[PDB]
Amino acid sequence: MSTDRESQLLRQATKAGIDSPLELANFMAQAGHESRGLSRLNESFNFTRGISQIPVEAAWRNGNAALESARQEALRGRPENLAELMYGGRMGNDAPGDALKYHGRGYLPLVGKENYERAGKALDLDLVNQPELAAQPEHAGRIAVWQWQTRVPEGARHDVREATYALNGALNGIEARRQRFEVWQQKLTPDVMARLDRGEVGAPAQTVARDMSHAGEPGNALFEDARQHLRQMGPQSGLRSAQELDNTAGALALGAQKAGLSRIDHLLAGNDGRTLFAVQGALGDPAMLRASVDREQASQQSLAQSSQQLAASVAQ
């Protein structure tokens, strides 16, 4: 599914010389955001909230009402009028129908007749006459790498904010791009990069990682604080298995890390036995920090999931 198209794009990118894990994560974050994880290879002309969502200033040149009428027509499957407002008379879209014919396609959307002309010439693809080729995953990958290597200067290859600006001349969805960037930085380990260099099909293997219950792993300090305090509660902790105690410690360390605690000094039961509160500092300290977990959900919450979420949280 997404894994197959993501693996294909990772191989195409590394085959084109995008070898830096930092540059590759950035490239993958921009492509993932602009195509919703490589699942949307065609531009959507559907705007359900309002015309304020339409990101092209030029679309208002015929007044607010003509733009609202084109929006309703696009929602009914006739986006020609909206495409003409958004891209007509720009980027080589001279003839009627060009704006929609050359709508965005690909991972780093190719839009406008002149960009289909330039990309076609550079990649030996008949994109002007068969623009649909730009929405085919294989060609889409080659076109995204070309957009990246020709529109992003070397100095902006490692920064999500600068790369987004060099690509789009504006900063849209920076939060979502930053989140995708941090996920790719975690996935592109040395062995994953080595398997991409070797050209392996399933190179992006995640593999079993050590959980926070192992010494030296991210969250281990908070995990041991939680585990010690759970064992101190004795039979009153309501935990009937070592596995449930470990799961609860993992959930507690995660909540603690998310709320800014560096240490769990105390564990308190509350909400009629349904909640566990992790506390940093004495209970009478007005600077005391706190975090809470649902006891039932925490006893069955995977320690591998808790360890993954805490590691990402610390990396953020």
Side-chain angles (χ1 to χ4, degrees), residues 87-155:
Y87 309 122
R90 306 193 305 103
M91 294 172 307
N93 298 329
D94 302 345
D98 283 350
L100 184 62
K101 177 173 183 179
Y102 301 111
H103 65 68
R105 287 184 182 82
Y107 301 135
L108 296 180
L110 193 67
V111 57
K113 187 181 186 178
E114 75 178 11
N115 296 312
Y116 279 75
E117 288 175 337
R118 295 172 178 176
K121 184 174 180 60
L123 305 175
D124 297 314
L125 288 173
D126 185 18
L127 297 186
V128 180
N129 297 314
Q130 306 174 57
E132 55 278 13
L133 288 175
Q136 295 180 359
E138 179 182 8
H139 306 303
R142 288 184 67 205
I143 298 166
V145 174
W146 174 82
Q147 296 263 53
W148 180 262
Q149 292 187 326
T150 62
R151 285 162 49 177
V152 181
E154 285 291 343

Side-chain angles (χ1 to χ4, degrees), residues 216-273:
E217 299 305 320
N220 183 245
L222 282 171
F223 175 82
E224 292 297 347
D225 289 350
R227 196 185 202 177
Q228 180 186 23
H229 287 103
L230 286 169
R231 292 173 176 174
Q232 289 173 3
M233 284 177 78
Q236 295 178 345
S237 68
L239 301 169
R240 298 286 292 185
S241 76
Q243 185 57 51
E244 284 176 308
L245 189 164
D246 288 346
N247 297 343
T248 306
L252 281 166
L254 182 55
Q257 174 67 41
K258 288 180 175 301
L261 283 70
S262 63
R263 190 191 308 267
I264 296 178
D265 295 321
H266 309 270
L267 279 184
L268 302 170
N271 188 16
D272 268 348

Side-chain angles (χ1 to χ4, degrees), residues 15 17 26 61 71 73 77 80 101 115 119 128 135 153 159 194 199 202-203 220 225 267 270-271 284 291 293 301:
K15 187 178 192 303
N26 192 7
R61 65 185 180 282
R71 185 186 67 139
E73 278 296 286
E80 187 77 70
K101 177 173 183 179
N115 296 312
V128 180
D159 180 332
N220 183 245
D225 289 350
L267 279 184
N271 188 16
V293 301
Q301 177 170 315

Side-chain angles (χ1 to χ4, degrees), residues 26-40:
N26 192 7
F27 168 80
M28 293 298 293
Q30 309 292 338
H33 174 77
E34 299 190 1
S35 63
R36 190 184 290 93
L38 312 183
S39 65
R40 190 211 303 104

